Coordinates of C-alpha atoms in Angstrom, one line a residue:
Chain A
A211 CA 156.4 92.8 89.4
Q212 CA 158.7 95.4 89.0
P213 CA 158.0 98.6 90.6
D214 CA 157.3 100.0 86.8
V215 CA 154.7 97.3 86.4
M216 CA 153.7 97.9 90.2
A217 CA 152.8 101.4 89.1
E218 CA 150.9 100.3 85.7
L219 CA 149.0 97.5 87.6
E220 CA 148.1 99.8 90.1
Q221 CA 146.4 102.2 87.5
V222 CA 144.4 99.3 86.0
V223 CA 143.2 98.0 89.2
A224 CA 142.2 101.9 90.6
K225 CA 140.3 101.6 86.9
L226 CA 139.2 97.8 87.3
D227 CA 138.0 98.7 90.8
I228 CA 135.4 101.5 89.8
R229 CA 132.0 101.2 91.9
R230 CA 130.3 99.5 89.1
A231 CA 126.5 101.2 89.6
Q232 CA 123.6 100.0 89.8
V233 CA 120.2 99.4 87.7
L234 CA 116.7 99.2 89.3
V235 CA 114.7 97.3 86.6
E236 CA 111.0 97.0 86.2
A237 CA 109.1 95.0 83.7
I238 CA 105.3 95.6 83.2
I239 CA 103.8 92.7 82.0
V240 CA 99.9 93.7 81.2
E241 CA 97.6 91.1 79.1
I242 CA 94.1 91.3 78.3
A243 CA 92.1 88.8 77.0
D244 CA 88.0 87.6 76.6
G245 CA 85.6 87.1 73.4
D246 CA 81.8 85.4 73.1
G247 CA 80.8 82.0 71.9
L248 CA 76.7 82.1 71.2
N249 CA 74.9 78.7 70.3
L250 CA 71.7 79.4 69.5
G251 CA 69.4 76.8 67.1
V252 CA 66.3 76.0 66.4
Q253 CA 64.9 72.4 66.3
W254 CA 61.2 71.2 64.7
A255 CA 60.1 67.4 65.4
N256 CA 56.5 66.0 63.9
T257 CA 55.6 62.6 63.8
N258 CA 53.2 62.9 60.7
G259 CA 56.1 65.5 58.6
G260 CA 59.3 65.0 59.7
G261 CA 62.0 66.0 61.9
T262 CA 65.2 68.5 62.1
Chain B
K368 CA 117.0 69.5 98.6
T369 CA 116.7 72.3 101.2
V370 CA 113.9 73.7 101.1
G371 CA 112.5 76.6 103.5
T372 CA 113.5 80.4 104.1
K373 CA 117.0 80.6 102.4
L374 CA 119.8 83.2 102.8
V375 CA 122.6 82.4 100.9
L376 CA 124.8 85.4 100.9
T377 CA 128.7 85.9 100.4
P378 CA 130.0 89.6 101.5
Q379 CA 131.9 91.7 100.4
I380 CA 133.6 95.1 102.1
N381 CA 134.1 98.5 99.9
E382 CA 137.1 99.6 102.0
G383 CA 134.8 102.6 104.1
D384 CA 131.1 101.7 103.7
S385 CA 129.4 99.5 101.0
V386 CA 128.6 96.0 100.6
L387 CA 128.9 94.4 97.5
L388 CA 125.8 91.2 98.6
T389 CA 125.9 88.5 96.1
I390 CA 121.9 86.9 97.0
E391 CA 120.9 84.1 96.1
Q392 CA 117.9 83.4 98.2
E393 CA 114.1 82.0 98.1
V394 CA 111.0 81.7 100.1
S395 CA 110.1 78.0 99.0
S396 CA 107.7 75.3 100.2
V397 CA 106.6 71.6 99.3
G398 CA 102.5 73.0 99.3
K399 CA 101.0 71.0 101.9
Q400 CA 102.7 67.7 103.3
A401 CA 99.3 65.4 102.9
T402 CA 98.8 66.5 99.5
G403 CA 99.9 65.1 95.7
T404 CA 101.3 66.8 92.4
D405 CA 100.3 66.7 88.6
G406 CA 103.5 65.4 88.0
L407 CA 105.6 62.6 89.5
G408 CA 107.9 64.0 92.5
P409 CA 106.9 67.4 94.9
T410 CA 106.7 70.7 93.7
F411 CA 107.7 74.1 95.2
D412 CA 106.3 77.4 96.0
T413 CA 108.8 79.7 95.7
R414 CA 110.2 83.0 95.8
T415 CA 113.7 83.8 94.8
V416 CA 116.5 86.4 94.2
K417 CA 119.9 85.5 93.2
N418 CA 121.7 89.0 92.6
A419 CA 124.9 90.8 93.6
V420 CA 124.0 94.3 95.0

């Protein structure tokens, strides 16, 4: 380009070529799970009387 | 599919010292060459990271 644009492109480039900063990203996924089933049940069977 | 230790890297040099590295890498495997899958084709254990640093 014209020397006028060369000097303008030269500032654009200098700004645009800046050392891009780096990022360390730690994620922390914590899950906790449990639970209590209970099955208690009583059956009575009688020949004479009846069964449950 | 090429599954093994892969490094695909296109380095780019700062005039002076510090390298911009575009990395796509992984350590991947077809489990066992004598083991199947619950699916249909082969499966892969991969450890991958594709980033520029």
